[PDB]
Amino acid sequence: MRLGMVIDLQKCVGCGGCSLACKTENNTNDGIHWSHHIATTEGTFPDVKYTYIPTLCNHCDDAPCVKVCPTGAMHKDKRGLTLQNNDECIGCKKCMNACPYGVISFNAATPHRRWQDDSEVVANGTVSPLMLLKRTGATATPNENPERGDTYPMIRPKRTTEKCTFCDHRLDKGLNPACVDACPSEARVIGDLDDPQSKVSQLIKLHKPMQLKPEAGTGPRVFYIRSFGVKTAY
């Protein structure tokens, strides 16, 4: 089994809804986005092309982040996913240097520290992050998703790395990744690339698949098909 994702760039409108869904799903600290993007502008006016490429962990066939991890915290599971036992992460950052794609973040900052602020913009009138935290019963942020704790810390400790888990906790329940459900055009599809009849397997035979940095030799399993833009008419 080799789970992976196919992203249809013609369907994609570059809105970031996938990345925002990832924020709500996985309780990433402010500034940490497991799902993100690579956007480029090319050409000189008036012949200008803008392209948006959504990015995530490619859950590689030959993951360097796994090979360099001294504790074994970063590992492959039986679905082909690259996951992390956060409890065994010593924050050495070797995975970040080994990953060619820059999709791993390091919790140098105390996650959700801004919610400990108890100042009020209008005293005894407006509320505060800390008060809102107390009112809702949340531990770190009122937006924290408890589902995440099924398989991974809902709130990660400082001095650990983290990245896209392919919403493994949702897959365990037979559900879809949050970013897949969040896409208005159904541009994102996941499946078993070892199953020739899966939608993903058929998509990359029906369309020419493209990968990010295949020359790095990791065998990424996020594939891009088609084109964000179209050739200019007239």
Partner 1 sequence: GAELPAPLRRTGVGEWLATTCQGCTSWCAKQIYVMDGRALKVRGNPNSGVHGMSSCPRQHLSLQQVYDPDRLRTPMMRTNPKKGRDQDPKFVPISWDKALDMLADKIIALRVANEPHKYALLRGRYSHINDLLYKKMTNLIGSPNNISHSSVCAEAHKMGPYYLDGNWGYNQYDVKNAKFILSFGADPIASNRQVSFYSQTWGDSLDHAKVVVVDPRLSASAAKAHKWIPIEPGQDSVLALAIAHVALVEGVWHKPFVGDFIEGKNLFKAGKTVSVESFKETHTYGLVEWWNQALKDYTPEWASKITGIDPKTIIAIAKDMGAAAPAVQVWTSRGAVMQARGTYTSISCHALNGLFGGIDSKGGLFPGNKTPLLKEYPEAKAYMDEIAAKGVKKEKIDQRGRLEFPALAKGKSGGGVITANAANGIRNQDPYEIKVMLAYFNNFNFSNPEGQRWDEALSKVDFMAHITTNVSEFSWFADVLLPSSHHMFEKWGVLDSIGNGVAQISIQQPSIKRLWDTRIDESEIPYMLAKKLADKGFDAPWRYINEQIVDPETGKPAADEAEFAKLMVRYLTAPLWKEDASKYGDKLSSWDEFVQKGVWNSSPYKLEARWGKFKTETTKFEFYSKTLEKALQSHADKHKVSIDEVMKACDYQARGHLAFIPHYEEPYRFGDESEFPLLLVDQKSRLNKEGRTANSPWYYEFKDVDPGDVANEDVAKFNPIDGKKFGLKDGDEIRITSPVGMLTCKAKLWEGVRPGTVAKCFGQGHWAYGRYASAKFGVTPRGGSNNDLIADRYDRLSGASAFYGHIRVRVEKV
Q: Which is nearer to partner 1, 23 or 94 (CB)?
A: 23
Is the Cα torsion angle 60, 61, 64, 69 positive or negative in sign? positive
Partner that binds at residue 229, options ligand SF4, partner 1, none, CB closer than 5 to 8 Å by kind: partner 1
Partner that binds at residue 99, options ligand SF4, partner 1, none, CB closer than 5 to 8 Å by kind: ligand SF4
CA-to-CA distance for 211 and 230, rounded, in angstroms?
A: 20
58 within 8 A of 220, measured Cβ to Cβ:
yes
Distances (CA, A) of 30 to 1, 107, 114, 140, 170: 34, 10, 9, 12, 23
Contacts of 126 by beta carbon, 8 Å cutoff, 6+ apart: 120
Q: Does 40 bind partner 1 (CB under 8 A)?
A: no
Is the Cα torsion angle 160, 155, 104, 4 positive or negative in sign? positive
Place of tokens 């970031």: 16
List of residues contacting ligand SF4 (CB under 6 A): 12-18, 21-22, 25-26, 34-35, 54, 56-60, 63-65, 68-69, 71, 73-74, 82, 84, 89-95, 99, 101, 103-104, 161, 163-167, 177-179, 182-183, 185, 187-188, 218
Question: Per the annotation, where are the binding residues for [4Fe-4S] cluster?
Answer: 12, 15, 18, 22, 57, 60, 65, 69, 89, 92, 95, 99, 164, 167, 179, 183
Q: Which is nearer to partner 1, 33 or 59 (CB)?
A: 33
Question: Per the annotation, where are the binding residues?
Answer: 12, 15, 18, 22, 57, 60, 65, 69, 89, 92, 95, 99, 164, 167, 179, 183
